[PDB]
Amino acid sequence: RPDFCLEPPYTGPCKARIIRYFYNAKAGLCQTFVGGGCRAKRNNFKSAEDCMRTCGGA
């Protein structure tokens, strides 16, 4: 899977309270975070489904 699957949630200078998903390699699951609504790359996904298809199993 992509190298970014092993990184922390990709946050940005995002004040918006929009939820995004990230793959937590330590737990093996996609979880939610606020702080990444203004970014759309690396470990930052619109849904858990996208997140698991891309990074699941890393």
CATH, residue 7: 4.10.410.10
The angstrom resolution of this structure is 1.8
Total length of the chain: 58
Residue with tokens 């990444």: 36
The Cα 23–Cα 52 span in angstroms is: 7
CA contacts within 13 A on the Cβ side of 8: 5
Assigned token pair, 14: 């995002």
Count of Cβ atoms closer than 10 Å to residue 14 Cβ: 15
Give the E-state strand segments of the chain in sequence order: 19-24, 29-34
Domain carrying residue 36: 1-58
Report the number of distinct structural domains present in the chain: 1
The Cα 40–Cα 22 span in angstroms is: 11
Assigned token pair, 3: 């190298």
The Cα 18–Cα 2 span in angstroms is: 24
